[PDB]
């Protein structure tokens, strides 16, 4: 009797194992830090882990772009979705820390992407900011605010 | 006086036995044929010629000597035994090599003819006597290998004549000179052995998944093949190499599935390649064809892996 | 735990439910394709439909529940459940969720993550149904039709008396299956002719050996047999008869349940894990129920020590060795084995009649590893009661015995009363491997009379050959690292008015190698029949030397002062189907003559029929060249066919293709599009698949494996959706230049689907021979014809014209 | 977070349902992966040609699950002489934490679902990318796709250190078409690509000045 052995196989293009419970918090007040001119909370540095089977490049394997709901009163920001509905916004920074990128544009490859071995760490900065129509009029209230940003890793 | 002249037949009959199993016993017909025949044993104690003018009694008894055990062309015994003996009279069954069949069809008649009462060994006469049939079932032995067979059974079947001179004469040939008769009549029979051993699946498909490379470096895929017998044989199977293996994994039977991916075959847990099992009666057993996919020297090249490993079961 | 579905799931809410799965770990009711596992095995290989819907059956105040697998009646019909005894799945309609609350211990854990549906049930709630045994509610019975099985061997001959060569064998097996009722008629004869100078004799004998009907019965798990057959040499010897026979079959019974092995008993504390190894291989590894347990399902092949080990849930152990007997009459504890046979006694002629009888021979075992076995033979002028028990004592071996009080009333005013008893013995696996396979002792009398002696005494006046005593001892011994199968045996029979007959047969199967590969076998034997004055010292010798590509054999034999030797070269060919031998021999007999045998053969296992030729010659008989044909046919099926049988046959139907190879016996099909595989066993799981590597390049097989279990002597239907032809795209250009809409079913003239059109003539037609005309059918009617040239090859986008009519 | 073993799922026209397994690398908190299949212009067509059989499914920490893709008449209402593209994407919803002022991140993936019809069904190791040709443009290059399957180039270079390591933007190729790509002129450009399986082989192009292909 012929016992031929046939199969299929693949390789796991996925995320690394160092940072699983990644949730950034903000220990900043709302009634004091958002009633004066600049309305910003301190930046919280968080990184994005990448253990793929080929660490030769970044744009030739992963086209990182991020989506989500956009803030109406603030162009270039995300919706906060909480007690301060429309009064606060979500800012986001790249690896250089100065390029205030847009909700829907792709990540600019070629810069600030240190290939630490077979991994690929992408540090990002995000701090909650207020819309100037609610900042100057001082209509923001203190409370709980939970925002969510979706980062699609559309591969090649 | 009592004269006996043995006259043996010359029939060479054939029959195809078909494709049988070891537990199955094929039945065959050994007919009586009234054809050409030749003398094999001559005696003279009384007169040598006759003109038919004296009183002489006649009797004629059939003589069939068939073998019980018979060796093969490879040296195996075939226990041929009777289920129905026909209208004959089987006697002297205490012998180990041969049966002795008899039939009294002509046992009391007076003749009036001019003949030769004791013929020489170079003699041929006419024989036209329709007799009853006889039948046998070949009870095959336990151990018998695969293939075709050309077994010939030795048999002396032939009408003897008993010449006497008085009314009420009873005389048969003694069995040791009847069993030390020449190997004249053969039988050309062929029968194909398909073997008592057979698997139940007849093709092995092992459902192993669409997996990642980290679990591809060490994975276990198992499939059980059930072999079911009704004979106490001791089988042996060889995992025959069919495709090209890539990596030299030592003593372990590596099956290269292609695209830089070998896989060893683990029969019953260990990587032996061949195992040893004894069976004692009718039943079945299980053999797990395990597979370990470590065919990697850390130069990974993913492809469709579709090798083969045919196992052939040979009866030793 | 509540999830973050309040932010977004998508741009809009999908409105299904969004909190229920979060708190209840609930699965969404949809169309899933799952594999259903019942107690570790699978009821289907590629199971398509498993539905999930929400049960709105039970009313409540909270109304928060979990969905379950909505199994309909067909997959619970093929689940192997005993619906006859438990009618809790009979009454179920497909509208509501099928609950299994009426049965105890049934848990259904649907884990869609692993793609499996595990169902765990107690063994008494369902049938046997393992990986190789389909249940008795699903037996693929035969289709109506007949069969012919021929065996012909014609040969020539050469003698010393003139010139003579004309011989033709005639064997055969006909029959017709009419539903479950199966007819069988085996005819065997011969056709010989002799042409001497002064005499030309010939004869033509042909006789129907056996006429019988047999209908398999699943409910009783035993086959009745009406017609002619024999009663095996069980207590009484072989005696032919015509009539009815309700014999208990063993092939209808599972293969791990055949024969004898005792049930493992004991009650320790909980759901333990049993493990029983015979020689380094586990025969049974599962979880027993909590409390008392008894394994009636283990009745496999074991002839010695078996350390049946129990391992509990906490980790406690207990070890005890139990013992088997393997005697021919003790069976499974709880179930029976029987033979209910009746009819008229056949003599030697075909139209021979006689007395009418009713003989019942049964064997039943109580469950304290004991068993009784009785026989009640009763005819109008002859009665014979047989009764007796057999039991395994364990450590001193095993016993069995019976009493037989036969009363024989002959018509000569002599009533014959005889009480004959016989005893049986065997032995287990010793440490130094001593095994007594059989040890009998038959105490009979001057007045013993079985059925065959009463048959010979009623009309043929035979009054000889009755056994007084018959006792044999048969020890068998194997030895590791020596590999010699020692088996000495000695019997001493004694007949009435005849003296004693002592037998002495020793044998040894030596297995070792010198200058060759391992697998070389050496056989030796010695036979000695001891009478009062003579001792027939017979000795047969066997030498078998294989070398992979060659298998040489040497056989020496000596009946009585005749040293006869033979040397063989039997071997297969490179394909495995053919085989050829070349063998010579020497025959130096006691009768002053030295003969030289020469035998050769050349077989060829062709897929239409088996064929072989044989060269055979000796001294005083020369050059007998012959041709042996052995094949068979199956007419009244779908189409007729021709094959490589002694029973059941599966009919594989692959329409349109001429030469597709099927597995089992490597049988190819014919011009009519059918084939019949013959190397199949009865009542087993038969996976008849095509050999997917050796197909022709013009044909393709979409799905290859189909499943069913055939009855003994049945013909089974298996359709095969195969296709023959090329791969094309017929870009159509009509008379007006248009293109018709979708659903244009392109169909061949034989009645086979080829494909359909998508939007503008891009119809992928598959399985088309070059040089035909098809039927493109849209709106349920024929509208246009086409014409394919011979020039069309595979993977083309050829300019096909659609000529209308 | 979830993980996908496929870098591009290939769906052959023979079997009506392929399997596609996902896993859960987290061992502290669960997740629920919900999936859908888009097309070339990227919209959530809820009742399109191919549908993911589990729409929303809870995943235990450390567990794994499969997402099967069933078959409708709309995949027959697609071209058979070429392939078809589809975008399989999936989101993950994490559980609501009790802490306040927490910003959440969803590390999601979108994969290319390659529908392959049964009419152009391929052999297990038939590399159709061997038939690819490249033409020289005065200021760059143009790659051509004669094969009816979707292929993807990722880099061109002269030596082994600069094709898949250089600063080069990748491009998607369509069946029976072509497109221009600006790059430096190489005498022997080796084709660095990614197949449907997931591996990254390399193959050389030997030309006669303008048009090149394999040996």
């Amino acid at each position: 009797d012929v016992a031929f052995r046939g199969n299929l196989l693949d390789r796991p293009c996925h995320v690394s194992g160092d940072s699983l419970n990644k949730h950034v918090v903000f220990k900043t007040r709302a009634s004091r830090d958002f009633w004066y001119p600049p309305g910003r909370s301190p930046t919280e540095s968080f990184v994005i882990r990448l253990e793929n089977c080929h660490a030769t490049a970044v744009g030739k394997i992963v086209t990182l772009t991020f989506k989500g709901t956009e803030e109406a009163a603030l162009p270039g920001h995300l919706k906060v979705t909480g007690v301060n509905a429309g009064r606060l916004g979500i800012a986001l920074l790249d690896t250089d820390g100065s390029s205030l990128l847009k909700p829907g544009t792709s990540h600019n490859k070629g810069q600030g992407e240190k290939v630490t071995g077979n991994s690929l760490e992408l540090p990002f900065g995000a701090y909650v900011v207020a819309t100037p129509e609610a900042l100057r009029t001082k209509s923001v209230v203190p409370g709980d605010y939970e925002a969510t940003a979706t980062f699609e890793l559309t591969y090649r | 006086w009592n004269n006996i002249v043995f006259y043996s037949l010359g029939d060479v009959n054939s029959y195809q036995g078909g494709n049988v199993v070891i537990t199955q016993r094929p039945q065959f017909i050994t007919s009586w044929r009234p054809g050409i025949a030749t003398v094999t044993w001559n005696q003279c104690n009384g007169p040598g010629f006759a003109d038919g003018f004296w009183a002489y009694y006649r009797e004629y008894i059939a003589w069939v000597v068939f073998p019980k055990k018979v060796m093969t062309q490879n040296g195996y015994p075939l226990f041929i035994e009777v289920h129905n003996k026909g209208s004959w009279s089987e006697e002297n069954t205490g012998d180990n090599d041969s049966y002795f069949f008899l039939k009294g069809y002509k046992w009391d008649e007076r003749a009036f003819d001019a003949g030769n009462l004791c013929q020489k060994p170079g003699e041929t006469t006419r024989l036209t006597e329709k007799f009853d049939d006889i039948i046998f079932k070949v009870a095959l032995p336990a151990d018998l290998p695969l293939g075709d067979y050309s077994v010939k059974i030795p048999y002396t079947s032939g009408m003897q004549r008993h010449f006497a001179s008085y009314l009420g004469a009873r005389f048969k040939i003694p069995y040791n000179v009847a069993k030390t008769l020449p190997r004249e009549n053969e039988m050309l029979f062929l029968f194909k052995n398909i073997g008592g051993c057979r698997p139940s699946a007849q093709s092995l498909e092992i459902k192993h998944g669409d997996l990642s490379i980290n679990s591809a470096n060490n994975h276990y895929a198992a499939q059980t093949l059930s072999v079911s017998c009704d004979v106490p044989a001791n089988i042996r199977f060889m995992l025959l190499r069919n495709t090209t293996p890539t990596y030299s994994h030592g003593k372990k039977f590596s099956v290269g599935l292609g695209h830089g991916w070998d896989s060893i075959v683990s029969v019953n847990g260990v990587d032996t390649g061949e195992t040893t099992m004894r069976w004692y009666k009718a039943g079945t057993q299980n053999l797990t064809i395990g597979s370990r996919l470590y065919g990697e020297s850390s130069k990974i090249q993913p492809g469709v892996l579709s090798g083969s490993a045919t196992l052939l079961m040979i009866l030793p | 735990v509540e999830f973050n579905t309040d932010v977004l799931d998508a741009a809009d809410k999908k409105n299904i439910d969004f909190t229920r799965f979060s708190e209840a770990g609930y699965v969404l009711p949809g169309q899933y394709l799952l594999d259903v596992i019942v107690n570790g095995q699978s009821i289907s290989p590629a199971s398509l439909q498993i539905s999930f819907v929400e049960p709105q059956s039970s009313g409540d105040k909270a109304e928060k529940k979990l969905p379950q697998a909505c199994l309909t009646s067909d997959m619970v019909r093929l689940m192997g459940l005993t619906a006859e005894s438990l009618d809790k799945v009979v009454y179920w309609h497909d509208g509501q969720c099928a609950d299994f609350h009426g049965l105890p211990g049934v848990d259904i854990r649907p884990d869609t993550g692993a793609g499996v549906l595990r169902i765990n049930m107690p063994q008494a709630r369902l049938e046997y149904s393992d990986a190789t045994w389909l249940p008795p509610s699903r037996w693929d019975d035969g289709i109506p039709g007949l069969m012919l099985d021929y065996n012909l061997n014609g040969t020539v001959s050469r003698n010393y008396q003139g010139g003579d060569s004309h011989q033709f064998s005639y064997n055969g097996t006909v029959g017709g299956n009419l539903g479950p009722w199966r007819l069988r008629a085996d005819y065997q004869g011969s056709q010989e002719q002799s042409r001497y100078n002064g005499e030309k004799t010939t004869n033509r004998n042909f006789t129907w050996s056996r006429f019988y009907l047999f209908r398999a019965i699943p409910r009783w798990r035993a086959n009745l047999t009406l017609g002619e057959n024999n009663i095996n040499s069980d207590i009484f010897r072989s005696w032919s008869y015509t009539g009815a026979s309700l014999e208990s079959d063993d092939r209808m019974l599972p293969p791990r349940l055949r024969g004898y092995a005792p049930q493992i008993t004991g009650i320790a504390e909980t759901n333990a894990r049993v493990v029983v190894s015979q020689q380094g291989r586990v025969l049974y590894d599962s979880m027993v129920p909590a409390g008392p347990f008894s394994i009636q399902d283990l009745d496999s092949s074991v002839r010695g020590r078996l350390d049946v080990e129990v391992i509990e849930q906490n980790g406690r152990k207990k070890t005890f060795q139990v013992d088997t007997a393997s005697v021919p009459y003790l069976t499974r504890p709880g179930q029976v084995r029987y033979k209910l046979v009746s009819g008229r006694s056949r003599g030697y002629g075909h139209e021979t009649e006689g007395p009418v009888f009713a003989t019942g021979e049964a064997s039943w075992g109580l469950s304290n590893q004991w068993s009784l076995y009785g026989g009640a033979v009763l005819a109008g002028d002859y009665n014979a009661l047989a009764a007796g028990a057999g039991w395994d004592l364990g450590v001193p071996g095993t016993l069995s015995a019976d009493i037989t009080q036969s009363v024989a009333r002959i018509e000569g005013e002599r009533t014959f009363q005889g009480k004959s008893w016989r005893l049986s013995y065997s032995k287990r696996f010793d440490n130094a491997d001593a095994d007594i396979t059989f040890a009998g002792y038959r105490f009979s009398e001057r007045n013993y009379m079985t059925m065959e002696q009463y048959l010979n005494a009623r009309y043929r006046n035979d009054y000889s050959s009755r056994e007084k005593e018959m006792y044999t001892v048969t020890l068998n011994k194997n030895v590791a690292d020596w590999n010699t199968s020692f088996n000495l045996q000695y019997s001493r029979q004694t007949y009435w008015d005849i003296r004693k007959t002592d037998y002495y047969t020793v044998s040894v199967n030596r297995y070792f190698n010198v200058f060759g590969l391992q697998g070389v076998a050496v056989g030796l034997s010695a036979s000695r029949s001891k009478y009062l004055g003579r001792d027939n010292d017979s000795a047969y010798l066997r030498i078998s030397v294989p070398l992979g590509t060659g298998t040489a054999s040497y056989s020496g034999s000596m009946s009585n002062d005749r040293y006869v030797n033979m040397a063989g070269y039997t071997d297969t060919f490179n394909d495995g189907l053919d085989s050829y031998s070349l063998n010579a021999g020497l025959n130096s007999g006691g009768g002053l003559t030295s003969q030289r045998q020469i035998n050769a053969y050349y077989s060829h296992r062709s897929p239409l029929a088996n064929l072989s030729a044989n060269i055979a010659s000796l001294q005083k008989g020369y050059t007998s060249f012959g041709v042996s044909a052995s094949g068979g046919a199956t007419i009244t099926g779908k189409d007729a066919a021709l094959h490589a049988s002694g029973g059941t046959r599966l009919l594989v139907d692959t329409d349109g293709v001429g030469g597709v190879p099927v597995d089992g016996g490597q049988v190819v099909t014919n011009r009519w599009g059918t084939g019949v595989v013959t190397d199949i066993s009865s009542y087993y799981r038969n996976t008849t698949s095509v050999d997917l590597k050796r197909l022709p390049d013009d044909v393709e097989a979409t799905r290859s494996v189909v499943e069913s279990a055939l009855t003994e002597g049945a013909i089974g239907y298996r359709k095969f959706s195969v296709l023959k032809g090329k791969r094309l795209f017929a870009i159509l250009r009509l008379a007006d230049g248009s293109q018709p809409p979708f659903g244009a079913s392109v169909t061949s003239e034989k009645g086979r689907e080829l494909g359909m059109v998508a939007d503008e003539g891009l119809a992928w037609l598959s399985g088309v021979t070059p040089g035909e005309t098809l039927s493109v059918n849209w709106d349920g009617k024929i509208q246009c014809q086409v014409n394919v040239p011979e020039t069309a090859i595979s993977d083309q986008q050829l300019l096909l014209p659609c000529t209308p009519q | 977070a979830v993980s996908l073993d496929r870098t591009r799922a290939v769906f052959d026209g023979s079997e009506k349902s392929m399997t596609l397994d996902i896993s859960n690398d987290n061992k502290q908190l669960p997740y629920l992966a919900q999936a859908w299949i888009e097309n070339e212009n990227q919209e959530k067509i809820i009742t399109g040609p191919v549908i993911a059989t589990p729409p929303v499914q809870r995943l235990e920490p450390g567990a794994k699950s499969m997402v099967r893709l069933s078959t409708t008449p709309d995949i027959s209402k697609l071209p058979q002489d070429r392939e078809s593209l589809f975008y399989f994407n999936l989101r993950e919803i994490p559980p609501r934490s009790e802490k306040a002022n927490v910003l959440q991140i969803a590390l999601q993936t979108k994969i290319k679902l390659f529908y392959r019809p049964a009419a152009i069904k391929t052999r297990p190791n038939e590399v159709w990318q061997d038939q690819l040709i490249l033409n020289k443009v005065s200021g760059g290059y143009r790659i051509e796709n004669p094969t009816p399957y979707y292929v993807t180039v990722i880099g061109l270079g002269g030596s082994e250190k600069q094709a898949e390591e250089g600063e080069f933007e990748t491009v998607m190729l369509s069946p029976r078409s072509e497109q221009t790509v600006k790059s430096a002129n190489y005498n022997t450009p080796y084709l660095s690509y990614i197949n449907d399986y997931g591996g990254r082989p390399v193959l050389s192009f030997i030309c006669n000045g303008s048009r090149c292909s394999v040996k």
Side-chain angles (χ1 to χ4, degrees), chain B residues 12 14 16 31 33 73-74 76 84 86 94 96 126 148 150 181 198 201-202 207 229 280-281 283 285, chain C residues 45 153 167 192 199 201 203 205 258 279 281 300 347 503 527 542 553 562 566 583 601 628 663 681 687:
Chain B
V12 183
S14 196
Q16 159 70 263
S31 305
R33 164 71 170 145
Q73 290 309 108
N74 302 146
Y76 298 107
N84 216 11
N96 69 323
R126 182 69 265 164
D148 173 89
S150 281
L181 271 180
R198 42 166 206 270
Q202 289 180 344
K207 312 182 184 195
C229 262
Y280 318 113
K281 54 172 199 67
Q285 262 166 20
Chain C
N153 188 15
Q167 211 274 337
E192 209 167 15
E199 53 188 359
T201 64
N203 64 320
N205 44 357
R258 297 184 307 202
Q279 45 190 358
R281 163 179 26 82
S300 298
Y503 282 76
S527 159
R542 174 172 72 92
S553 53
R562 309 187 179 165
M566 272 193 309
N583 70 94
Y601 53 77
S628 86
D663 210 74
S681 318
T687 68

Side-chain angles (χ1 to χ4, degrees), chain C residues 6-54:
Chain C
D6 55 319
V7 63
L8 58 95
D9 49 348
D12 60 329
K13 193 167 71 73
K14 297 299 150 284
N15 320 305
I16 61 171
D17 203 304
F18 274 119
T19 177
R20 201 154 178 212
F21 44 87
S22 164
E23 63 185 342
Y26 173 103
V27 289
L28 211 57
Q31 183 44 64
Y32 287 18
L33 60 156
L34 266 283
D35 199 325
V36 63
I37 290 184
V38 174
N39 310 311
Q41 56 98 33
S42 173
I43 78 170
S44 186
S47 169
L48 193 137
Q49 175 79 42
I50 292 298
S51 194
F52 282 164
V53 85
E54 191 68 27

Side-chain angles (χ1 to χ4, degrees), chain A residues 1-10 12 14, chain B residues 204-206 208 210-211 213 257 305-307 309 311:
Chain A
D1 43 350
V2 50
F4 61 97
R5 172 75 272 197
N7 277 123
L8 201 60
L9 181 144
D10 279 319
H14 69 297
Chain B
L204 275 303
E205 295 322 289
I206 316 167
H208 163 216
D210 208 348
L211 86 169
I213 215 68
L257 268 81
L305 63 163
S306 186
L311 58 95

Side-chain angles (χ1 to χ4, degrees), chain C residues 722-739:
Chain C
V722 290
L723 295 174
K724 183 178 179 180
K726 315 297 196 39
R727 320 262 81 88
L728 263 303
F729 310 108
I731 38 171
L732 68 98
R733 283 98 45 208
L734 284 170
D736 55 332
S738 174
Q739 278 143 346

